[PDB]
Design a protein around this ligand. Sequence first.
Ligand SMILES: N[C@@H](Cn1cc(Cl)c(=O)[nH]c1=O)C(=O)O
Ligand SMILES: N[C@@H](Cn1cc(Cl)c(=O)[nH]c1=O)C(=O)O
Ligand SMILES: [Zn+2]
Ligand SMILES: [Zn+2]
Lengths: 258, 258
Amino acid sequence: RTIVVTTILESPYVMYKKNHEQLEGNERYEGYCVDLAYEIAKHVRIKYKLSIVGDGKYGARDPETKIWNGMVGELVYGRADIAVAPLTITLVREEVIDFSKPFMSLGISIMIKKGTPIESAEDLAKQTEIAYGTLDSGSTKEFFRRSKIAVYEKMWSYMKSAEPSVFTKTTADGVARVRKSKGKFAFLLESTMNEYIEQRKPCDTMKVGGNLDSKGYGVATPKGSALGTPVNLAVLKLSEQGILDKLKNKWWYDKGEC
Amino acid sequence: RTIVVTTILESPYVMYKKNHEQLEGNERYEGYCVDLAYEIAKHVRIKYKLSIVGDGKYGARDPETKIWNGMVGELVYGRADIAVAPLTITLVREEVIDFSKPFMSLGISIMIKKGTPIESAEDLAKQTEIAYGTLDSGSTKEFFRRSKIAVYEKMWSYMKSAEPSVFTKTTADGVARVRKSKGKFAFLLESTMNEYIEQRKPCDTMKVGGNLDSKGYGVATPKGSALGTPVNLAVLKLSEQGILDKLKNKWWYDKGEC
Ligand SMILES: N[C@@H](Cn1cc(Cl)c(=O)[nH]c1=O)C(=O)O
Ligand SMILES: N[C@@H](Cn1cc(Cl)c(=O)[nH]c1=O)C(=O)O
Ligand SMILES: [Zn+2]
Ligand SMILES: [Zn+2]
């Protein structure tokens, strides 16, 4: 009767509170999705316990084993009742789980160290002085893999034979590599994260150009779950009341340092 | 076995072809949603006939009669099998029909005649020299009605006792009233339409400020329809292939006159 809510450690969605080591249960965490879970759980009238995904992944299906991993895997095999996180809505996933209507809108984008002579994906693909990559094992990576557009077809061929490995294990690791590499590495990541990093000290990065595509994040439940319909209406309710906007302001911009 | 596809006359989604009066069936029309219907019908493998909604409305429920009107009404009473149009995803509607994941992202916005001293909704609400309104009987109107935010709570109180009537019967009628009124009338409309009008002669209007909210358009089917799942996957497929973006470019910007 207590719902398991799977999520992922990723600022500023879910983070350890300043004195987390001295608390317990849901009180250890704070962030955008901690609040969202609270508001949803309040319209749907349920008790819940937040739970961090063991492998830290979003959700992909192994081509040989055909097992699903990450948060998606937790719903498919029945270990979690709902996922509340920055999980992208895609065709492959929608075949195996359900999504609510988007609670956030976004697209792929470019992050550079201030001063780098880059304005577009066309600028990146036509040179090799500057190396670039993506988070691993996510929808961003997958996007370049499956592209039939010329410029992106060019970029993925570079990233393919990149030495050393151009991908990263974490968003944090990417940003760090941008900050350390003195403008010789650029990072391709979702614009929600790009926009957040930009308002954080040391204030040395920035988003350049427009977005590569359009998409959204959804709250997910296993196929045929009874919580699916109540969760969708709840999301639409919060959007219509200005709660969603109020929450982005709180965690992105009301605490901006630059 | 031939699917009825309800839609609405609204540029540049659906329009009469240059010589429509000399054609028949689906050949009379052209636009963004005519193409979209074609691509969806091709992945879902069906034959279809486009049909223009009799009353020209989007979809609202009469508070005394409790009958639903517009395109929404056509699905609820079973006269159409699917709707393909700029129909906004809302909580009230989602209770009575189904929506696919959004094929377009947008929000409420401000249209002015070039030269008008307005930059924001805050600028509008704090004065009466300049009159303003919205399309009637749609989600935009409804948004100001239900708002509990101070500035919008102020704006809807004006529009309420406006003399003469500040609302309009058509998008076209609003734009026209902006162009004719020498900067004494401003129009609040969805930004998709604002952006399109801006790239049309006489090139005398423009979008000012940021969007009031975030939302999307969806393709709709009656509750429990068997076409619901195939239509959703088809939309996600077209989005992932760059078809959606390709189509917005075609009807908005590849033919821009300004
Ligand atoms: N949202 C993604 C994960 N994800 C996240 C970031 Cl910040 C990114 O740059 N790329 C991603 O794939 C998904 O659901 O796989
Ligand atoms: N999308 C709306 C209709 N609609 C359209 C325009 Cl262009 C507008 O400015 N306001 C609206 O309500 C709905 O579905 O009711
Ligand atoms: Zn710690
Ligand atoms: Zn004619």
